[PDB]
Amino acid sequence: GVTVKDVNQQEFVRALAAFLKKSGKLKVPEWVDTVKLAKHKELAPYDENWFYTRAASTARHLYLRGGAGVGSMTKIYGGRQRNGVMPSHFSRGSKSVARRVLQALEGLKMVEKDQDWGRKLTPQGQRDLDRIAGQVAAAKK
Amino acid sequence: TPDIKLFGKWSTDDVQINDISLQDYIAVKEKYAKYLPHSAGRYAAKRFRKAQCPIVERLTNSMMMHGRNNGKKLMTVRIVKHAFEIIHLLTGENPLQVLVNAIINSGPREDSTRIRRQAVDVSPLRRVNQAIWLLCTGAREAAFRNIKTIAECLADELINAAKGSSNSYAIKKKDELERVAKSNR
Amino acid sequence: GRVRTKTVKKAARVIIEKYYTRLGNDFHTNKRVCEEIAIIPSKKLRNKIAGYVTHLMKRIQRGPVRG
Amino acid sequence: HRIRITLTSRNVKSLEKVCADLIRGAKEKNLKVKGPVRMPTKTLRITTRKTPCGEGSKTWDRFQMRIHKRLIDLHSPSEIVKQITSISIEPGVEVEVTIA
Amino acid sequence: RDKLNNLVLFDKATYDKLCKEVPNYKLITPAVVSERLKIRGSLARAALQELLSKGLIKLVSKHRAQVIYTRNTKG
Amino acid sequence: SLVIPEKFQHILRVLNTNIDGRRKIAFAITAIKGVGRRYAHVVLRKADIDLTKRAGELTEDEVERVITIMQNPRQYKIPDWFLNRQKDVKDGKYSQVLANGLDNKLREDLERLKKIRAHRGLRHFWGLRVRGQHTKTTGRRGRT
Amino acid sequence: GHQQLYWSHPRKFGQGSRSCRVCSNRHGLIRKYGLNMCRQCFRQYAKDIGFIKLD
Amino acid sequence: RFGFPEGSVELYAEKVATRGLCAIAQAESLRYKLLGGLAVRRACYGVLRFIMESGAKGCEVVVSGKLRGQRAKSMKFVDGLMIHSGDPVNYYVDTAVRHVLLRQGVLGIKVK
Amino acid sequence: MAVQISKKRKFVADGIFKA
Amino acid sequence: GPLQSVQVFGRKKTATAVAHCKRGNGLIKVNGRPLEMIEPRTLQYKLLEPVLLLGKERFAGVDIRVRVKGGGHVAQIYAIRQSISKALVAYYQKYVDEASKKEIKDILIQYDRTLLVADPRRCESKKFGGPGARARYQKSYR
RNA sequence: ACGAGACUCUGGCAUGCUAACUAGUUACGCGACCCCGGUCGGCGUAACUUCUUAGAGGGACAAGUGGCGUUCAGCCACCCGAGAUUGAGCAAUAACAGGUCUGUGAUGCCCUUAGAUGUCCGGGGCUGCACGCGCGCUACACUGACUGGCUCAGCGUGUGCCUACCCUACGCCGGCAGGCGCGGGUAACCCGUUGAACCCCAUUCGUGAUGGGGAUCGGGGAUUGCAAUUAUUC
Q1: Chains with 3 or more CB pairs closer than 8 angstroms to H?
Q2: Alpha-carbon gap, residue B37 to B177, rounded angstroms
């Protein structure tokens, strides 16, 4: 018996990407082709279906720490505001690209809202995170 | 495994120091065999404390240089590891032998001081310090504006220095620093 | 870097002049001797004085001292 | 009855003298009093250029102002605190008391 | 002055060289294969995912900064 | 496959611009004055165009879908906020503008600002820094 | 009229409204903790307020 | 001015016990000798004598400004024992700095 | 207090008063 | 029987980490995850040294929980490295013989003093007229 | 005797002490999920104070041993040890025609004051540009750039007198910038477990002024203000 924490986290994002490739009931937005992920990026992501990469990755930030709302999931998805010729600083993600993940994951009962705000993780979601964690535990033998 | 300490996976024993003179100041075979290059620190508290550093850590430290790389030891622990792959996957010998045989042949036996400038034979530690500098110089130089990567250049220098080919940058400097020193003695 | 100032050495050479009998080679006693036989406002200065007391006590037991 | 002496001093030893008198006074009436809690000290920081003008070597002051906060939880009626805390004031400490 | 113009896709002779002479070496790194055979560094990485699934190379170390392959073992 | 294919295209001429097809299509499109590294992506995204492939392998009829997505943003579904000449002053259309077109739109900015005699315009003629920079120390090699 | 243009520049912000509470000059002010005091005056009364140079 | 309700405030005044050692008490004492018209040598030695008679460790009376002539002189008057540096200066040396308006210039009075 | 100033600023508004 | 709780903190910077030793099996975890998948992955063998030097025989009746907060990445690797080392010295002191305690202490000293004894080094304070502690701004002449 | 030092503050250290529903812990119970047995910053109350916090103290003194030295002052390597040179603050006599009259309702003197050098109101200016220097930022790449994923800080600050102006969790609209409704915090009580970057992990890139470099300039979307053209900034 294993959980996501006993599993390598860096490969685990793809195990839950494939879980939401197989479901296909997320309703991905339409700007997803034309968008820049954060105000501090230069190019569009390499992966054609980057939404499934992070919609996976969002739940396993909501798993480890419960109640990370819009503002929290723009910090953990923060990088470098590379300001060209001026010094580079910290920049957050985008409110649109992170909320439409949190709205897409609320439908299929994996995330859930709580009093004093913030998306927690529903009793059901902890299963479909750990059942694929057992698959990676079998893949590494 | 408390019987032998596998530097990542590499043999500490069966590493022969050929030069009797550098034998103390090149110190990894006994009581210095640690699994990473990366130790805590405390090899710049006193004068000859630098001598009792595991020599791959010295080689790892002398890499993180030319500004942008300063204090990126995690990044260059990996460089020297991926270079030891290249040495064994060519030479067939343990790269710690190929390191030690480079360090013996990289550091110059004399340097020209200024008391025309005078000739003087250098300290054994002066060789070790100038060995690790001169082969981390050529490794950095050749890899610059190049398709060839660091560890390919870091493991070209470590192999070519032990060979004594005068293809390694480290050997040209050693052979010419003594060429200058022989001229003005 | 560690040279005793005249303030430490004068306090030392007067304590060993007066309270010689209580003193000896052991630091940690003649550290605590100074708590009874002086009013010293610093802990760091107490140890400096008591330290050079022990250094003079190993000298006095061997032969005569200048001061 | 959840009475709470918020002791906030600019000094250190005047706060020790106050909070020691708020224990040595409380014990003989036989009321259970929690030990004086230490809240993490808040240091103010104003770095000024020393110079009235801007000419010389660019030297700076480092004006600290350490502030210390304590609390003392009391299991006592609302009247007993008015009797003890009025006795033996000293101007360093700001002796504030919360009801609930 | 001197402008090295490498191959983005394989000349017929160069894939005939790459599918013959590359496993005959003692190292297969995507920077030596690029430098020697006059091909591209990215292309020399793409060549060795295909020759991985042929079973004619040997995956010793793989990192983002540096992947190393070698000849197939003697036995 | 990875071998040099038949009908491989080294030297292309896509919208009066010499392109070397040895480059990737992601960045071989950029050679035309008015399409950048950023705009080149979302054009190739509007059709199922495998973007690991270089600009020599690509089909002689496929390049016409590539251009039409650029020439019509609104109809092939590229938004308002992603275009280089949004709300033009004269004709008032939201067009992505290319090679000699971008010379022509940036001509009508200069000739407008000349005739109206605006302070912003007067500096373009004088050959100065116009976005309100300091010139006291910077811009030396440009003027003698 | 006169009184309708005598002080008819908004003083709701800017460094030209807020001033040293000793000097009535508008340069090098300590707005931190509402000292609202020119750096030269703060230094004059650094001791009296409770500030001290220990470090 | 300080926005206090009526009756909250009550002002009092006690005489300074051994007032010789309070510096700004001896600074004002010097401030009105020079503004009254006593000689600068006579005035300051008068203060310096009074605070050694007060049984102090030391003192330092610096008078800076136009002393008998256009050019600015300094007249430092030092006797007894004076510490300058370290932490103890914060609680061993009472330091006054005051001004005075002579009719030709401002004299700065530094009692320590 | 109606404005309810912070303890950081309590020792500054009172410090200024003493000065 | 009762508990055998042994809580030991380890520091190699502002990074502190507390290793809790009890009776159990050899399940040594750090904020829940064991010592295999704690990034960064370059310094793997640094965390295995108290397991490499002493073996799993000393980690037989010892199950370790390490809660880590403060500092950076490579500080925290050395913060947890020290805790699980000293906790194995501490658990093998309170409840058992002192001869095997000294035995197990002596092996870790003769590897590295860092395994037990912390380094007191912290970031030396910045001074005005320079970017860092011991560095000044470029001086202009002529 | 002053200065130096000592001193005060700060870095290190106490599994001893005094202590904590505004700081945690190991528990205990309960709840989810995992296949007899784990994870959990999900919910709470018996013992605590290792961790955290700040109180009194405690310790380190060339004190230990061995070289060196008139055998003195000391110095050197090692031993034990949390430390065997943590930093800062303060700072002598005598001064300088050093800087400040543009910090002051510190001020002497001259100059001014209804035809203003006071004053306050709109515009312009300090930015202006053939040029010379100073401090800097960003870079010239493959020890790299891009795109994902990951994993960790510590100083601090925050709704104010006059004085409007605070940091802001959470929830929707929107590519960004933001816009708008809901609650906390005058603070170890809320932001916040400050998910900080470098770095780490995997892609894509290939010696090419190249996916290095972002100067330059056109186009539109917002914000702050009574107002931004001489782009406030984004």
Answers
A1: none
A2: 30
Distance CA C3, CA E59 (A): 65
Torsion sign, CA atoms B42, B44, B46, B47: positive
Which residues of chain J have a CB within 8 Å of the CB of D57? Answer: 129
For chain J, first and last CA: distance in Å?
Answer: 82
* Deposited resolution, Å: 3.1
Q: Does residue J33 belong to the interface with chain A, where contact is any CB pair within 8 Å?
A: yes
State which residue of chain J sits closest to A6, comparing Cα positions: J33
In angstroms, rounded to a whole number, what is the distance separating the alpha carbons of residues D30 and A111?
53
- Of the options 3.40.190.10, 3.30.70.600, 3.10.20.30, 3.20.20.80, the CATH number for the domain spanning D1-100: 3.30.70.600
E-strand ranges in chain G read none
J24 dihedral zone (left: phi>0; alpha: psi -120 to 50; beta): left
Which residues of chain I lie closer than 8 angstroms to G33, CB-CB? Answer: 8-9, 12
Specify burial of residue C51 (Cβ count, 10 A radius: 0-12, 13-18, 19+): middle
Check whether residue F98 and residue F140 sit in a common domain: yes
Give chain F as a 3 state SS string.
CCECCCCCCCEEECCCCEEECCCEHHHHHHHCCCCCHHHHHHHHHCCCCCCCCECCCCCCCHHHHHHHHHHCCCCCCCCHHHCCECCCCCCCCCECCCHHHHHHHHHHHHHHHHHHCCHHHHHHHHCCCCCCCCCCCCCCCCCC
Residue D75, φ and ψ in degrees, nearest 5: -105, 80
- Token readout for F43 is 């054009």
**Looking at CA atoms only, how far is residue J41 from chain B in angstroms?**
9
Q: What is the spatial distance between Cα D7 and Cα D36, in angstroms, rounded to a whole number?
A: 9
Chain G residues with CB under 8 Å of D64 CB are 51-55
Tokens of C38: 């002086």
Give residue F43's identity as a one-letter amino acid code. Answer: V
Q: Is A107 within 7 A of strand K by CB distance? A: no
Residues F15 and F75 in one domain: yes
Tell me phi and psi for residue J108, to 5 degrees.
-80, -35
Rounded to whole angstroms, the distance from the CA of residue F43 to the C1' of nucleotide K214 is 24
C1’ K134 / CA G19, Å: 33
Q: Which two tokens stand for residue F101?
A: 């077109």
Give the domain extent around F27: 2-79
> Would you kindly state where each structural domain of chain D is located, as residue ranges?
1-100
CA distance J23 to J35: 19
State the method: cryo-EM
Half-sphere exposure of E31 (CA within 13 A, CB side): 14
Is residue B170 within 8 A of residue B130, CB to CB? The reply is no
User: Which of A73, A115, A123 is closest to A93 using CA atoms?
Assistant: A73
Q: Check residues 39 to 68 of chain F and report those whose beta carbon is under 7 Å from nucleic acid strand K.
A: 52
B/e letters for F65-84, b = 16+ CB within 10 Å, e = fewer, are ebeebbeebeeeebeeebbe
What six digits make up the tokens of A49? Answer: 């279906």
Let me know: does F35 contact F70? Beta carbons within 8 Å: yes
Per-residue flag: A49 CB under 7 A of strand K: no
Place of tokens 């343990």: B94
Both structure tokens of F107: 């001509």
Q: How far is the CA of D17 from the C1' of K185 (A)?
A: 32
F42 to A43: CB separation less than 8 angstroms, yes or no: no
Check CB contact of I18 with chain D, cutoff 8 Å: no
Per-residue flag: D89 CB under 7 A of strand K: no
**Cα–Cα distance for residue pair C40/A23, rounded to 1 Å:** 80
**CA-closest candidate to residue A45, choices A12, A88, A93:** A93
Contact A120, A67 (CB under 8 A): yes
Q: Are residues F59 and F104 in the same domain?
A: no
- Tokens representing J12 are 């190699």
